[PDB]
Coordinates of all heavy atoms in Angstrom, one line a residue:
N44 N 0.8 -1.2 0.0 CA 0.0 0.0 0.0 C 0.9 1.3 0.0 O 0.5 2.3 0.6 CB -1.0 0.0 1.2 CG -2.3 -0.6 0.9 OD1 -2.5 -1.8 1.1 ND2 -3.2 0.2 0.3
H45 N 2.0 1.1 -0.7 CA 3.0 2.1 -0.8 C 3.5 2.3 -2.2 O 3.7 1.4 -3.0 CB 4.2 1.6 0.1 CG 5.4 2.5 0.1 ND1 5.3 3.8 0.6 CD2 6.7 2.4 -0.4 CE1 6.5 4.4 0.5 NE2 7.3 3.5 -0.1
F46 N 3.6 3.6 -2.5 CA 4.1 4.1 -3.7 C 5.6 4.4 -3.6 O 6.1 5.2 -2.8 CB 3.4 5.4 -4.2 CG 3.9 5.9 -5.6 CD1 3.8 5.1 -6.7 CD2 4.6 7.1 -5.7 CE1 4.3 5.5 -7.9 CE2 5.1 7.5 -6.9 CZ 4.9 6.7 -8.0
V47 N 6.3 3.8 -4.5 CA 7.8 4.0 -4.7 C 8.1 5.0 -5.9 O 7.7 4.7 -7.0 CB 8.6 2.7 -4.8 CG1 8.4 1.8 -3.6 CG2 8.3 1.9 -6.1
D48 N 8.7 6.1 -5.5 CA 9.0 7.2 -6.5 C 10.3 7.0 -7.1 O 10.6 7.5 -8.2 CB 8.9 8.6 -5.8 CG 9.1 9.7 -6.8 OD1 8.1 10.1 -7.5 OD2 10.2 10.3 -6.9
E49 N 11.2 6.3 -6.4 CA 12.5 6.0 -6.9 C 12.4 4.8 -7.9 O 11.5 4.0 -7.9 CB 13.5 5.6 -5.8 CG 13.1 4.3 -5.0 CD 12.2 4.6 -3.8 OE1 11.3 5.5 -3.8 OE2 12.4 3.9 -2.7
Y50 N 13.4 4.9 -8.9 CA 13.6 3.8 -9.8 C 14.7 2.9 -9.4 O 15.9 3.3 -9.5 CB 13.8 4.3 -11.3 CG 13.9 3.3 -12.4 CD1 13.3 2.0 -12.3 CD2 14.7 3.6 -13.5 CE1 13.5 1.1 -13.3 CE2 14.8 2.6 -14.5 CZ 14.2 1.4 -14.4 OH 14.4 0.4 -15.4
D51 N 14.4 1.8 -8.9 CA 15.3 0.7 -8.6 C 15.1 -0.4 -9.5 O 14.2 -1.3 -9.3 CB 15.1 0.2 -7.1 CG 15.3 1.4 -6.1 OD1 16.2 2.2 -6.3 OD2 14.6 1.3 -5.0
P52 N 15.9 -0.5 -10.6 CA 15.8 -1.7 -11.5 C 15.8 -3.1 -10.9 O 16.6 -3.4 -10.0 CB 17.0 -1.5 -12.5 CG 17.4 0.0 -12.4 CD 17.0 0.4 -11.0
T53 N 14.9 -3.9 -11.4 CA 14.7 -5.3 -10.9 C 15.4 -6.3 -11.8 O 15.5 -6.2 -13.0 CB 13.2 -5.7 -10.9 OG1 12.5 -4.6 -10.3 CG2 13.0 -6.9 -10.1
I54 N 15.9 -7.3 -11.1 CA 16.4 -8.5 -11.8 C 15.4 -9.5 -11.6 O 14.8 -10.0 -12.6 CB 17.8 -9.0 -11.2 CG1 18.9 -7.8 -11.3 CG2 18.3 -10.2 -11.9 CD1 20.2 -8.1 -10.4
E55 N 15.1 -9.9 -10.4 CA 14.1 -10.9 -10.1 C 13.7 -10.9 -8.6 O 14.5 -11.3 -7.7 CB 14.6 -12.3 -10.5 CG 13.4 -13.3 -10.5 CD 13.9 -14.8 -10.5 OE1 14.9 -15.2 -11.0 OE2 13.1 -15.6 -10.0
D56 N 12.4 -10.6 -8.3 CA 11.9 -10.5 -6.9 C 10.6 -11.2 -6.8 O 9.7 -11.1 -7.7 CB 11.7 -9.0 -6.5 CG 13.0 -8.2 -6.4 OD1 14.0 -8.8 -5.9 OD2 13.0 -7.1 -6.7
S57 N 10.4 -11.8 -5.7 CA 9.2 -12.6 -5.4 C 8.4 -12.1 -4.2 O 9.0 -11.7 -3.2 CB 9.5 -14.1 -5.4 OG 9.6 -14.5 -4.0
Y58 N 7.1 -12.0 -4.3 CA 6.2 -11.5 -3.2 C 5.1 -12.4 -3.0 O 4.8 -13.2 -3.9 CB 5.6 -10.1 -3.6 CG 6.6 -9.0 -3.8 CD1 7.4 -9.0 -5.0 CD2 6.8 -8.0 -2.9 CE1 8.3 -8.0 -5.2 CE2 7.7 -7.0 -3.1 CZ 8.5 -7.0 -4.3 OH 9.4 -6.1 -4.6
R59 N 4.4 -12.3 -1.9 CA 3.3 -13.1 -1.5 C 2.2 -12.4 -0.8 O 2.5 -11.5 0.0 CB 3.9 -14.2 -0.6 CG 3.0 -15.5 -0.7 CD 3.9 -16.7 -0.8 NE 4.6 -17.0 0.4 CZ 5.3 -18.1 0.6 NH1 5.4 -19.0 -0.4 NH2 5.9 -18.3 1.8
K60 N 1.0 -12.7 -1.1 CA -0.2 -12.1 -0.5 C -1.4 -12.9 -0.5 O -1.8 -13.5 -1.6 CB -0.5 -10.7 -1.2 CG -1.5 -9.9 -0.4 CD -1.7 -8.5 -1.1 CE -2.7 -7.7 -0.2 NZ -3.5 -6.7 -1.1
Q61 N -2.1 -13.0 0.6 CA -3.5 -13.6 0.6 C -4.6 -12.6 0.4 O -4.6 -11.6 1.0 CB -3.7 -14.4 1.9 CG -4.8 -15.4 1.8 CD -5.0 -16.3 3.0 OE1 -4.7 -17.5 3.0 NE2 -5.5 -15.7 4.1
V62 N -5.5 -13.1 -0.4 CA -6.6 -12.2 -0.9 C -7.9 -13.1 -1.1 O -7.8 -14.3 -1.3 CB -6.3 -11.5 -2.2 CG1 -5.0 -10.6 -2.0 CG2 -6.1 -12.4 -3.3
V63 N -9.0 -12.4 -1.0 CA -10.2 -13.0 -1.4 C -10.7 -12.4 -2.7 O -10.9 -11.2 -2.8 CB -11.3 -12.7 -0.3 CG1 -12.6 -13.4 -0.6 CG2 -10.8 -13.2 1.1
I64 N -10.9 -13.2 -3.6 CA -11.4 -12.9 -5.0 C -12.6 -13.7 -5.3 O -12.5 -15.0 -5.2 CB -10.3 -13.1 -6.1 CG1 -9.1 -12.2 -5.8 CG2 -10.9 -12.8 -7.5 CD1 -7.8 -12.5 -6.6
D65 N -13.7 -13.1 -5.6 CA -15.0 -13.7 -5.9 C -15.4 -14.7 -4.8 O -15.8 -15.8 -5.1 CB -15.0 -14.4 -7.2 CG -14.9 -13.4 -8.4 OD1 -15.1 -12.2 -8.2 OD2 -14.5 -13.8 -9.5
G66 N -15.1 -14.3 -3.6 CA -15.5 -15.1 -2.4 C -14.6 -16.3 -2.1 O -14.9 -17.1 -1.2
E67 N -13.6 -16.5 -2.9 CA -12.6 -17.5 -2.8 C -11.2 -17.0 -2.3 O -10.6 -16.1 -2.9 CB -12.4 -18.3 -4.1 CG -13.5 -19.3 -4.4 CD -13.7 -19.6 -5.9 OE1 -12.8 -20.1 -6.6 OE2 -14.8 -19.2 -6.4
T68 N -10.7 -17.6 -1.2 CA -9.5 -17.2 -0.6 C -8.3 -17.8 -1.4 O -8.4 -18.9 -1.9 CB -9.3 -17.6 0.8 OG1 -8.3 -16.8 1.4 CG2 -8.8 -19.1 1.0
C69 N -7.3 -17.0 -1.6 CA -6.1 -17.5 -2.3 C -4.9 -16.8 -1.9 O -4.9 -15.7 -1.5 CB -6.3 -17.5 -3.8 SG -7.1 -16.1 -4.6
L70 N -3.8 -17.5 -2.2 CA -2.4 -17.1 -2.0 C -1.8 -16.8 -3.3 O -1.6 -17.6 -4.2 CB -1.7 -18.2 -1.3 CG -0.2 -17.9 -0.8 CD1 -0.3 -16.8 0.3 CD2 0.5 -19.2 -0.3

């Protein structure tokens, strides 16, 4: 829930989040 103003070029990064979409929970 954060905006990054800086440009930090990516090679490869992985993230994870649980959410509910159309009443179905997922990772």
Side-chain angles (χ1 to χ4, degrees):
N44 268 94
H45 180 64
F46 182 65
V47 301
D48 185 78
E49 63 269 37
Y50 182 28
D51 297 325
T53 314
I54 301 167
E55 194 195 333
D56 294 324
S57 95
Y58 301 73
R59 207 135 72 172
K60 191 176 184 210
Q61 201 174 249
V62 305
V63 183
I64 301 167
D65 296 340
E67 281 151 65
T68 202
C69 41
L70 188 65

